[PDB]
Design an enzyme around this catalytic site. Sequence first.
Site, mmCIF file in Angstrom:
data_model
loop_
_atom_site.group_PDB
_atom_site.id
_atom_site.type_symbol
_atom_site.label_atom_id
_atom_site.label_comp_id
_atom_site.label_asym_id
_atom_site.label_seq_id
_atom_site.Cartn_x
_atom_site.Cartn_y
_atom_site.Cartn_z
ATOM 1 N N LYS A 226 -37.922 35.500 14.279
ATOM 2 C CA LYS A 226 -37.257 35.086 15.430
ATOM 3 C C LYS A 226 -38.196 34.182 15.966
ATOM 4 O O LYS A 226 -39.081 34.320 16.056
ATOM 5 C CB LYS A 226 -37.145 36.459 16.210
ATOM 6 C CG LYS A 226 -36.059 36.345 17.115
ATOM 7 C CD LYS A 226 -35.684 37.954 17.706
ATOM 8 N N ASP B 283 -32.760 51.326 23.025
ATOM 9 C CA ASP B 283 -31.757 50.549 22.728
ATOM 10 C C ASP B 283 -31.423 51.377 21.324
ATOM 11 O O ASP B 283 -31.125 50.478 20.434
ATOM 12 C CB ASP B 283 -31.979 49.128 23.014
ATOM 13 C CG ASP B 283 -30.707 48.371 22.829
ATOM 14 O OD1 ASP B 283 -29.602 48.807 23.268
ATOM 15 O OD2 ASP B 283 -30.764 47.256 21.971
#
EC number: 2.7.11.1
Lengths: 272, 274
Positions: B45, B137
């Site tokens: 990323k 999450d």
Amino acid sequence: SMKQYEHVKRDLNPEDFWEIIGELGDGKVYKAQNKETSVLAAAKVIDTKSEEELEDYMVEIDILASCDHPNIVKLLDAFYYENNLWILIEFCAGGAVDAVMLELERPLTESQIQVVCKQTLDALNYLHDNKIIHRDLKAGNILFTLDGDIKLADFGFIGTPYWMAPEVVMCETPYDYKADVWSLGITLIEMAEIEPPHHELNPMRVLLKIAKSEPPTLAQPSRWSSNFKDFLKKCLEKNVDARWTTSQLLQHPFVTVDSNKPIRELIAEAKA
Amino acid sequence: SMKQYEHVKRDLNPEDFWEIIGELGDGGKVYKAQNKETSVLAAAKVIDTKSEEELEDYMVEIDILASCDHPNIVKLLDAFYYENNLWILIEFCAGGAVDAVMLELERPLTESQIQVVCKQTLDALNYLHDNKIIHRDLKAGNILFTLDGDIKLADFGSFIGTPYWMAPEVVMCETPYDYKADVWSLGITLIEMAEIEPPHHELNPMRVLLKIAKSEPPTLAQPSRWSSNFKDFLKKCLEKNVDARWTTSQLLQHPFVTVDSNKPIRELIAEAKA
Ligand SMILES: COc1cc2nccc(Oc3ccc(NC(=O)/N=c4/cc(C)o[nH]4)c(Cl)c3)c2cc1OC
Ligand SMILES: COc1cc2nccc(Oc3ccc(NC(=O)/N=c4/cc(C)o[nH]4)c(Cl)c3)c2cc1OC
């Protein structure tokens, strides 16, 4: 998104959960027993006036809490209560290596040094692997378990110079992993002779000696194997680039050991 | 005395050490990278870090990840700050996310497959909770399949966001620790794997918030299709009373997560490959 809560508990009395059952060393280290599990800890109650100092300690606590190796001492608990910081770590019944030498009034045998060297090296190699330096490796910070094993601890201004590496003294500059390897070398001589090299010298004169003199050697070479003296040469190499890594040292014949029996016997003498 | 060096390299070009092969998701951009010296595969990323206050916020998440060491949690392989970008490289998980597998195949997981994922995910979560970390999450999009048939837990990344996995106590702003909210989300994730979509997916997102705060816990659409062990495990996760809701340590003792084999998942990947 992922959140990590603090490793120190607040607004809770440590002695609700741990009973102090005696003193171990003279700052003061205490012996504690968990009131619900019966687990044994060593406890240190450090006076934390400055809130800026508490953050400085909490940094060391976070590093310890994130470590997970059988040869590094585990944090069992930490509390901030009535302006004290309690640190509780796994109790190591055999005590420190320096205390064993003082109690028995003898250095370690080569067989015993060999086991300590190998296990300490496993600990250190794990630290280095995880971008951590110990910085204070000495015999007083190597603890015996009860099953004959080592756990690396940190009992706690320039301080004492005996274990310092030449590049730190000479301020020669990316990472300082190699300085731990030097200290390991000094620690081995310390275990062979009770006292570290240059113990008889003024601390200022020791700084001079480390910077200017040939690496220290064993006082009586003929008492020790070639494997051991050779291992020392790799640790106590003043050229940082020639000095071995922990990964290279793990391949040395001196630490090709299998039994921890020498240590089991050493702490059976100490217990008597 | 103990010192930890930083987990992010500086003044060094990431592409000296990693080649970008291709792209994995454009659902931010996640890249596929291969180590130039070891041939190891990573997901990468490359996040734009203008704000120095944002870099510190990410570096915190990197430290947590770097300190984790569990087979069912994705490992940080490398991190760089170079020409105002932050590169994060983590272990490549060839099977991809669980949600993408369900959408590609157009089928939910079987109970056997959910069972393997639930057990492995619960080992990961329990490890987090043990080390005073909350995931926050947990959803099927953050569970990745490996080539071998295992799970690794990841995190793909004044707005409220999507409500489906949120716990009642978070929606009702009721308050020391939120470990239990992860357990609720685990419950929602299991239903999501049984039905592709999470409960209340057909509702307006506002109506989902209402439902979470005011309604009975969500259930499987077709209880008769599932074992009592599974539905019972769900009742322990999807308990609106926070104190009655089980811990991951309690859940580890549940019969639903006694599994000896990942074969259901290996067979799921063999269907996908066909
Ligand atoms: C049987 O005899 C002993 C056994 C022991 N077993 C375990 C630990 C002992 O003492 C400690 C040694 C180091 C630390 N602490 C430590 O490693 N880290 C830190 C870090 C910071 C800031 O705060 N402590 C502690 Cl708590 C305790 C022991 C002391 C003994 O008597 C000699
Ligand atoms: C085959 O298809 C995929 C395979 C993948 N294999 C591994 C990782 C993948 O994506 C990522 C998932 C999560 C994170 N990051 C993460 O878990 N944590 C962090 C932590 C911080 C601060 O920054 N991200 C990353 Cl980098 C990448 C993948 C995405 C794919 O395509 C769908």
